Scaffold this active site. Structure first.
Site, short mmCIF file in Angstrom:
data_model
loop_
_atom_site.label_atom_id
_atom_site.label_comp_id
_atom_site.label_asym_id
_atom_site.label_seq_id
_atom_site.Cartn_x
_atom_site.Cartn_y
_atom_site.Cartn_z
N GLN A 146 0.72 0.85 10.24
CA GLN A 146 -0.60 0.23 10.12
C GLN A 146 -1.09 -0.44 11.41
O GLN A 146 -2.29 -0.56 11.66
CB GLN A 146 -0.64 -0.67 8.93
CG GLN A 146 -0.97 0.13 7.66
CD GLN A 146 -2.41 0.69 7.68
OE1 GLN A 146 -3.36 -0.05 7.83
NE2 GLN A 146 -2.50 2.01 7.73
N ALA A 184 0.82 -1.22 0.00
CA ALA A 184 0.00 0.00 0.00
C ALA A 184 0.86 1.28 0.00
O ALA A 184 0.42 2.39 -0.29
CB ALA A 184 -0.90 0.00 1.22
N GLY A 185 2.15 1.06 0.40
CA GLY A 185 2.98 2.22 0.58
C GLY A 185 2.75 3.02 1.90
O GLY A 185 3.06 4.19 1.94
N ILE A 186 2.16 2.35 2.93
CA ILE A 186 1.90 3.01 4.23
C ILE A 186 2.43 2.24 5.49
O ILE A 186 3.12 2.81 6.33
CB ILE A 186 0.40 3.40 4.35
CG1 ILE A 186 -0.59 2.22 4.35
CG2 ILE A 186 0.04 4.37 3.24
CD1 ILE A 186 -2.06 2.67 4.38
N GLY A 187 2.14 0.93 5.59
CA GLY A 187 2.45 0.24 6.85
C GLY A 187 3.94 0.10 7.18
O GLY A 187 4.53 0.83 7.98
N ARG A 188 4.53 -0.86 6.44
CA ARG A 188 5.98 -1.14 6.37
C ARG A 188 6.83 0.10 5.92
O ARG A 188 7.87 0.43 6.49
CB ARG A 188 6.19 -2.37 5.47
CG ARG A 188 5.64 -3.67 6.06
CD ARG A 188 5.86 -4.91 5.17
NE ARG A 188 4.86 -4.84 4.12
CZ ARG A 188 4.52 -5.89 3.40
NH1 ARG A 188 5.25 -6.95 3.43
NH2 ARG A 188 3.42 -5.92 2.70
O1 LIG Z 1 2.14 -3.27 2.37
C1 LIG Z 1 1.87 -2.88 3.62
O2 LIG Z 1 2.73 -2.97 4.44
C2 LIG Z 1 0.51 -2.19 3.86
O3 LIG Z 1 0.47 -1.14 4.52
N1 LIG Z 1 -0.52 -2.78 3.25
C3 LIG Z 1 -1.91 -2.40 3.36
S1 LIG Z 1 -2.39 -0.96 4.17
C4 LIG Z 1 -4.01 -1.37 3.83
C5 LIG Z 1 -4.16 -2.52 3.15
C6 LIG Z 1 -2.88 -3.20 2.89
C7 LIG Z 1 -2.61 -4.55 2.25
O4 LIG Z 1 -1.45 -4.86 1.68
O5 LIG Z 1 -3.47 -5.38 2.24
C8 LIG Z 1 -5.47 -2.92 2.57
C9 LIG Z 1 -6.17 -1.59 2.32
O6 LIG Z 1 -6.31 -0.85 3.51
C10 LIG Z 1 -5.12 -0.43 4.16
C11 LIG Z 1 -5.53 -0.45 5.60
O7 LIG Z 1 -6.69 0.35 5.67
C12 LIG Z 1 -6.50 1.73 5.54
N2 LIG Z 1 -5.38 2.49 5.45
S2 LIG Z 1 -5.44 4.10 5.43
O8 LIG Z 1 -4.98 4.63 6.64
O9 LIG Z 1 -5.01 4.63 4.13
C13 LIG Z 1 -7.15 3.95 5.47
C14 LIG Z 1 -8.14 4.97 5.37
C15 LIG Z 1 -9.48 4.65 5.40
C16 LIG Z 1 -9.90 3.31 5.42
C17 LIG Z 1 -8.94 2.30 5.52
C18 LIG Z 1 -7.61 2.64 5.47
#
Ligand SMILES: O=C(O)C(=O)Nc1sc2c(c1C(=O)O)CCO[C@H]2COC1=NS(=O)(=O)c2ccccc21
Length: 297
Positions: free
Chosen positions: A261, A216-220
């Site tokens: 995340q 997603a470009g956010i967690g890791r």
């Molecule tokens: O590769 C990673 O390390 C990673 O971060 N992966 C993510 S972050 C993530 C997902 C995944 C995934 O690979 O399945 C599934 C979609 O939702 C976000 C989680 O949900 C949300 N993220 S957000 O904070 O952008 C937000 C806003 C509103 C509703 C949900 C969300």
């Protein structure tokens, strides 16, 4: 200290409330262009978008949209570009973005397959004989070689802008045992991968911002960047006690949503920074210790 806060957080078991707290405080800005109908298929997840103010624009007249943000850390004086794992139709935009933004390095923190699913396109060549040409943005990509370790691989790529036949070498740093919505095996192997990317020159300010991604470009990616910035900050003053990790994560989420995340990635960030502070604070010998620990070979 942060180390006091850590123990104290741990003691009362309140990481999830801390993290929830951050989630509540985090910024919210419009992502109108991300949300335009023409861009539906340029976004991997419905829920993850670039704010308009910080999004990276392609230098193309057709459609400048890519799911990517410039995280610009003013006080630290480092920027990154965080993006999602390229889709099969936007590997040309991804490589366009790195050419235009003049990044020397891309950090990939995920596998193209995780949890049974395709989390990312195979956007780079897996062997020398079979280069990739991205015809839509007119770029060529070649594996020049790679250095495979038990938990990560670095590749040297050549990126050719076919339109002028300019050429650039891009270093690819690929972490392949950091689990989706999990954490690195330990602080030492995380720090060793991070210092591999530091030692490499790619983070240096003579280059465009490094592009870091996961799926997603956010967690890791947020984890990776938060630790690096914290260490940088500590570095320039040599003062650990003027870094506020949660506060830095919050300056970060001004530029992209959702950075980090879960609450354990949060807690791993403190682990990573507290450990790395050893090196920042003049004990360089720890660096080769991280390497031993991490069992790279
Ligand atoms: O590769 C990673 O390390 C990673 O971060 N992966 C993510 S972050 C993530 C997902 C995944 C995934 O690979 O399945 C599934 C979609 O939702 C976000 C989680 O949900 C949300 N993220 S957000 O904070 O952008 C937000 C806003 C509103 C509703 C949900 C969300």
């Amino acid at each position: 200290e942060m180390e006091k806060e850590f123990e104290q957080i741990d003691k009362s078991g309140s990481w999830a409330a801390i993290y929830q707290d951050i989630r509540h405080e985090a910024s919210d800005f419009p992502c109108r262009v991300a949300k335009l109908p023409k861009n539906k298929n340029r976004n991997r997840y419905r829920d993850v978008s670039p704010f308009d103010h910080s999004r990276i624009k392609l230098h193309q007249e057709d459609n400048d949209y890519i799911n990517a943000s410039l995280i610009k850390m003013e006080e630290a004086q480092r920027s990154y570009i965080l993006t999602q794992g390229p889709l099969p139709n936007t590997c040309g935009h991804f490589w366009e973005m790195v050419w235009e933004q003049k990044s020397r390095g891309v950090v990939m923190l995920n596998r193209v397959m995780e949890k049974g699913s395709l989390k990312c396109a195979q956007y780079w060549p897996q062997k020398e004989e079979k280069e990739m040409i991205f015809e839509d943005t007119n770029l060529k990509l070649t594996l020049i070689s790679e250095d495979i370790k038990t938990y990560y691989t670095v590749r040297q790529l050549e990126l050719e802008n076919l339109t002028t036949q300019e050429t650039r070498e891009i270093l690819h740093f690929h972490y392949t045992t950091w689990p989706d919505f999990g954490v690195p095996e330990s602080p030492a192997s995380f720090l060793n991968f991070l210092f591999k990317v530091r030692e490499s020159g790619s983070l240096s300010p003579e280059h465009g911002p490094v592009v870091v991604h996961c799926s997603a470009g956010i967690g890791r990616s947020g984890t990776f960047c938060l630790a690096d910035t914290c260490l940088l900050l500590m570095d320039k003053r040599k003062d650990p006690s003027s870094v506020d990790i949660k506060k830095v994560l919050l300056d970060m989420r001004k530029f992209r949503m959702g950075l980090i995340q879960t609450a354990d990635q949060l807690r791993f960030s403190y682990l990573a920074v507290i450990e790395g502070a050893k090196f920042i604070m003049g004990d360089s010998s720890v660096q080769d210790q991280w390497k031993e620990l991490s069992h790279e070979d």
